[PDB]
């Protein structure tokens, strides 16, 4: 009875010392004085460790006797100037996974990372029930509670819905004046990247409510911070129930974070500071910007300067349109490479898979054409025939990297025609008729039909793809391994230079260590490239101008009536391609007008790709 108040005081003086969280109280409060933000604050456990070790160890080891006091202190501060708490920072040995969670950790605050495997349907929960009595003309109210509402244990109460007033007057429900709170239950499993091969994985349930009720979707990588609890009685109460059962366990979540990985739905994100923005703006002034940002892509590969420029343009992307009637004009860029063996194709696909904010990788004969377009007519537990998302659906607003693209059969290639140009997946099969969004872009690699590019034969004899498919690819590049003497000396020296490199903080001969990269979502280094791309894509939308209009219309007309031979046919789509590329370049310069240089660069790039 007295420890509670002492703990309340100790958290009040903890808030008093560190004034950051005080600031973040006026913040979600002055703004609710005209989306109401939710009253949840986040505290760093490192600060709480450096302030008071005993209180820190209590939260980590004995949450049920330390958290409610902190919540009461926080509510008191807010009212003086309820509010709930979330925790971030180091967790020591408490940071576990579904495989390593044992009975030793029950009734402790833990953080668990894994893959979200099964979500539920959000439902409301009754928390206060109001009633009206017309005979007396008065309002009454009842309250309810359950085990999973508070951390401490409270004697069960006899939940009963009132129907008659003490005087006998009949009551009627006032559904609009009652209180309801949302509730979801999810399942977390051990990630495939960490689970041992050939062994069945382990799972754990998590319960979320209120403002944490819908923040992740199945198949995502998640990190949940909450209390590991026990409920019920494993036959103990019963005189004779069984001797082979135990108590039921679950996690009362209070924080959920989505983690970004490779070939996963969640998209990476960084927090941009004033320093980052200033540096980006300063860097964008230099005239060689398109070359600085372009030679820094895969700097361990020699040459391919134009494929690298195309990669950067695809990363930046153009601007799409939506007319009033309801028309849609594509705004993405797609790339195809056809090449000889050992021309650094799969090593550029993997670079894109590793540097793009969201990308999914797929091979050729590997994934069928229903696994890409989401034809997952399946059934759920409720019984509703549902479509399960696919590679191109999950990659909405992302990229798809296709390796061995020539091995994909026609029955599988024809499913991608709609996605590459209409940017939708309309599935109509027994009992189901729906349309999903697939606004993705594609980068694909392939090799000739003869093993190597035969220069004597016509391009159609080598590439061997339909013109329908070839039109949808914006840029098609041909790469050849021609044996030289001057070039071989340079490419050997470069390769041998790469193979002699020591990471900082290592001793020559010491093996290097590898780790998995699970970041927390929300020449120049790679991080700066990501920051630059994010800023440019999120805060720039250029507009066409007459000069670009003239350059594009001249180039298109000249290309259509030509006596040359092209690796791909020329249609109306090419015009749009010229408009896209131009816009992308204007996006790289952080300009709001597609100037003439943009159009000229687009023309040069397309002409190199074709001729």
């Amino acid at each position: 009875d007295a420890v509670f108040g002492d703990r309340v005081r100790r958290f009040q003086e903890f808030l008093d010392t560190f004034t950051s969280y005080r600031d973040s109280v006026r913040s979600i409060q002055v703004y609710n004085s005209n989306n109401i933000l939710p009253h949840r604050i986040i505290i760093s456990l490192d600060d709480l460790r450096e302030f008071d070790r005993s209180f820190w160890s209590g939260i980590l080891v004995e949450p049920a006797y330390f958290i409610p006091p902190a919540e009461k202190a926080l509510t008191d501060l807010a009212d003086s100037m309820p509010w709930k708490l979330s925790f971030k920072g180091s967790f020591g040995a408490h940071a576990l996974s579904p495989r390593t969670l044992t009975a030793q950790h029950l009734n402790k605050l833990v953080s668990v990372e894994g893959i979200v495997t099964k979500t539920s349907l959000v439902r409301p929960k009754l928390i206060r029930s109001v009633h009206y009595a017309a005979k007396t003309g008065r309002f009454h109210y009842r309250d309810y509670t359950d085990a999973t509402t508070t951390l401490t244990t409270r004697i069960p109460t006899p939940a009963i819905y009132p129907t008659e007033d003490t005087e006998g007057n009949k009551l009627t429900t006032e559904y609009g004046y009652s209180t309801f709170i949302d509730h979801q239950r999810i399942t977390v499993q051990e990630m495939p990247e960490m689970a041992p091969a050939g062994q069945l994985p382990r799972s754990i349930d998590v319960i979320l409510d209120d403002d944490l009720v819908d923040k992740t979707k199945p198949g995502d990588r998640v990190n949940v911070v909450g209390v590991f609890k026990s409920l019920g009685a494993g036959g103990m109460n019963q005189s004779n129930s069984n001797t082979l059962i135990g108590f039921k366990t679950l996690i009362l979540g209070n924080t959920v974070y989505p983690l970004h990985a490779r070939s996963t739905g969640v998209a990476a994100r960084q927090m941009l500071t004033d320093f980052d923005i200033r540096n980006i703006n300063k860097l964008s002034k230099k005239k060689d910007i398109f070359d600085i940002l372009s030679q820094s892509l895969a700097p361990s590969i020699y040459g391919h300067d134009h494929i690298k420029k195309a990669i950067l343009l695809m990363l930046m992307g153009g601007v799409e349109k939506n007319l009033e009637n309801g028309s849609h004009l594509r705004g993405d860029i797609n790339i195809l490479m056809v090449g000889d063996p050992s021309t650094a194709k799969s090593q550029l696909l993997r670079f894109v898979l590793n540097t793009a904010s969201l990308a999914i990788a797929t091979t050729g004969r590997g994934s069928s054409g229903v696994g890409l377009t989401a034809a997952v007519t399946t059934d759920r537990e409720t019984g509703e025939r549902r479509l399960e998302a696919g590679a191109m659906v999950l990659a909405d607003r992302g990229v798809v990297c296709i390796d061995e693209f020539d091995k994909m059969t026609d029955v599988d290639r024809v499913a991608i025609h709609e996605v590459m140009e209409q940017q939708t997946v309309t599935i109509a099969k027994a009992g189901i008729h729906t349309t999903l969004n697939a606004r993705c872009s594609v980068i694909a690699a392939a090799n000739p039909v003869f093993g190597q590019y035969d220069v004597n034969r016509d391009p159609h004899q080598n590439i061997a793809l339909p013109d329908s498919l070839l039109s949808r690819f914006d840029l098609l590049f041909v790469v050849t391994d021609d044996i030289n003497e001057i070039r071989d000396r340079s490419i050997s020296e470069h390769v041998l230079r790469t193979h002699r490199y020591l990471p900082p903080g290592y001793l020559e001969g010491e093996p290097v260590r590898e780790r998995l990269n699970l970041s927390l979502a929300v020449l120049v280094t790679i991080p700066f490239l990501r920051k630059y791309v994010q800023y440019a894509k999120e805060r720039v939308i250029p507009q066409l101008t007459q000069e670009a209009i003239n350059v594009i219309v001249k180039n298109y007309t000249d290309l259509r009536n030509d006596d040359n031979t092209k690796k791909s046919p020329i249609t109306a789509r090419t015009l749009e391609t010229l408009i896209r590329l131009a816009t992308a370049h204007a996006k790289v310069r952080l300009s709001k007008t597609v100037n003439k240089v943009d159009a000229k660069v687009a023309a040069n790039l397309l002409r190199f790709a074709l001729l």
Partner: protein, 632 residues
């Protein structure tokens, strides 16, 4: 136990304002008194309350200066309680049948259904009162905070049940004492009464047995529906969700599968504290009016008159289909004739002939075939869009399924049954399996489907018009090969089309500049270039085509003689080419029927009861120009 709390509401003043509104409001005498007079006189089974009327009434009373209450806000927050308040007032001000006819719970006496109509947005802006009931919301934006309120949901209907009886007030009778007992029901299941509870039976030692009386009970009409989200509302990378709807009273049969709608209702709750939810429908609003619901009201006549008197209507209405696509004037004309259609014909004997037009577009890559099927699926009021790959044949015709609401087993229909009385636009026609196209033949010709698999031995009805898109055998066109072999459709399937356009892309330095300028203008400005042409909006165009579809022109003999001569000419001219193997096929009677149908449709678009001869001339010109690219 059961403490008390204080609230600002007052269910006494509001009932008085309810009566004042209901017997003192005028837009003829009082507005709602007349509606009650119709109800008494047995001409109206439904009374509807417009919240705009209440808002205006209270605004006028504020102008009077006398204090009042915010009735509309009270209804918006707690709407399931005001239904009975209004019913009570309506039962105390009803008149007596001026015409002639040929204690107990109050609902046995009532014969009328009360519905609330949301508060408009224009009225809100007129009187500065942001409206919560007229803000469309997705199935994903409806959370616990909205339980008990009056809201609207925008979506697409997926499944609908069959109207069934639902008992609201069971009645019983006692053969021993003769009393009547009434039981109210507000749950999915119930337990009936067994032994008599009257004064006499109570006093006596022999208590009688009660019996349910079906005729005396208050049976209502119940239906249930499911609504999903539109693809424009789902977030990035998610899957759309669904929601349930209950319909009771005189709204049944107002929702059909596949219709995009705005539905207003009350969000009400249904061992645990968790609860299921549902929307009690109060008012439906369709985004595209069905053609077979048209009436020549004064307003619609005024609107159609301007189009009629504006000279060129055929070109105005053909240039207005996808005004962002340059050229393709004849294609757009044949697609405008697709919407109207011919005139079906029953010969009085056991024979019938269709009246719908089927169209096909075969062309080279990048000629905007798909973007015209996506505009035609949007202009039509009941349009469907499907792609050749994403189809199964069954997925187009039908299969079996079981109804959760009732216990009946039902047959589910595909895209060609959803598009009934509409266009079923099929893209990538060539790439779907030939064993899947063969189910389209019967739909094209007899407008029916015949299923003889297990469990089901029956027929369906599909009055659909097919707009198909396809490509040549090897991508681009090959001038060396014959026109017939270049395409890959059997002769039987070709004959069933009435228009088959060949949109070949032949570069030419002069006309490509025009296309480039049009497209790049469409991108710099978000609208189309021409400043002399003002396209007719989709609503005004749908309204004109609906007016046109009511005609049924006939033909004279002076046109019959021309039709026969043209048919003989074509059917003789065709054999030479067909034998020569540079051709498209061989003319058959279906060509004659297609010419007749195209003439009828052109006659209808002119609002005429007779088919002129300039219509059989326009029809022949279209059928000729259909192939005037192969003769470049």
């Amino acid at each position: 136990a059961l403490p008390s709390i204080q609230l600002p509401v007052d269910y006494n003043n509001l009932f008085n304002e309810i009566t004042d509104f209901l017997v003192t409001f005028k837009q003829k005498g009082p507005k709602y008194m007349a509606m009650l007079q119709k109800v008494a006189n047995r001409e109206l089974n439904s009374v509807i309350i417009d919240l705009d009327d209440i808002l205006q009434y209270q605004n006028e009373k504020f102008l009077q200066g006398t204090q009042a209450d915010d009735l509309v806000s009270a209804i918006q927050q707690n709407a399931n309680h005001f239904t009975e308040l209004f019913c009570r007032a309506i039962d105390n001000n009803m008149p007596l049948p001026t015409k002639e006819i040929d204690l107990f719970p109050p609902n046995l006496t009532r014969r009328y259904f009360l519905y609330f109509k949301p508060l408009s947005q224009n009225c809100a802006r007129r009187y500065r009162k942001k409206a919560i009931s007229s803000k469309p919301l997705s199935v994903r934006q409806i959370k616990g905070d909205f339980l008990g309120q009056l809201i609207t949901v925008r979506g697409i209907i997926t499944r609908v049940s069959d109207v069934k009886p639902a008992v609201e007030v069971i009645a019983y009778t006692c053969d021993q004492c003769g009393y009547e007992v009434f039981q109210e029901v507000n749950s999915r299941t119930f337990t009936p009464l067994s032994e008599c509870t009257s004064e006499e039976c109570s006093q006596n030692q022999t208590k009688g047995q009660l019996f349910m009386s079906t005729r005396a009970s208050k049976f209502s009409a119940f239906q249930e529906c499911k609504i999903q989200e539109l693809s424009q509302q789902v977030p990035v990378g998610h899957i759309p969700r669904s929601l349930n709807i209950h319909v009771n009273g005189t709204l049944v049969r107002s929702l059909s599968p596949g219709d995009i709608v705005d539905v207003t209702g009350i969000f009400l709750p249904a061992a645990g504290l968790l609860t299921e939810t549902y929307l009690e429908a109060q008012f439906v609003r369709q985004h595209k009016k069905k053609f077979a619901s048209f009436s020549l009201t004064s307003d619609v006549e005024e609107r159609v008159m301007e189009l009629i008197t504006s000279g060129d209507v055929y070109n105005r209405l053909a240039k207005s289909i996808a005004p962002e696509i340059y050229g393709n004037l004849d294609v757009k004309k044949a697609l405008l004739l697709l919407l109207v259609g011919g005139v079906d014909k029953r010969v009085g004997d056991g024979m019938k002939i269709r009246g719908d037009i089927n169209v096909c577009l075969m062309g080279d890559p990048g000629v905007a075939k798909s973007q015209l099927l996506k505009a035609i699926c949007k202009i039509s009021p009941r349009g469907v869009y499907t792609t050749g790959k994403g189809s199964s044949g069954v997925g187009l015709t039908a299969a079996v399924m079981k109804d959760p609401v009732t216990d009946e087993m039902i047959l589910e229909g595909g895209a060609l049954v959803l598009a009934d009385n509409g266009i079923c636009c099929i893209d990538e026609f060539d790439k779907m399996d030939e064993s899947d196209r063969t189910a389209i033949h019967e739909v094209m010709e007899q407008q029916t489907i015949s299923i003889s698999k297990a469990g089901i031995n029956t027929t369906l009805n599909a009055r659909t018009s097919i707009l198909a898109a396809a490509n040549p055998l090897y991508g681009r066109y090959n001038p060396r090969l014959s026109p017939l072999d270049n395409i890959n459709l059997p002769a039987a399937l070709l004959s069933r089309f009435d228009i088959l356009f060949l949109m070949l892309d032949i570069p030419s330095r002069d006309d490509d500049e025009k296309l480039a300028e049009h497209v790049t203008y469409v991108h710099m400005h978000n609208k189309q270039p021409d400043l002399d042409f003002t396209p007719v909006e989709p609503s005004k165009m749908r309204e004109y085509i609906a007016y046109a579809k009511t005609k049924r022109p006939v033909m004279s003999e002076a046109v019959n003689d021309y039709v026969v001569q043209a048919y003989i000419r074509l059917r003789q001219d065709s054999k030479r080419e067909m034998d020569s193997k540079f051709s498209f096929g061989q003319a058959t009677p279906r060509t004659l029927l297609g010419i007749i149908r195209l003439s009828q449709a052109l006659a209808k678009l002119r609002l005429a009861d007779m088919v002129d001869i300039d219509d059989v001339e326009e029809a022949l010109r279209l059928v000729r120009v259909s192939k005037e690219s192969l003769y470049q």
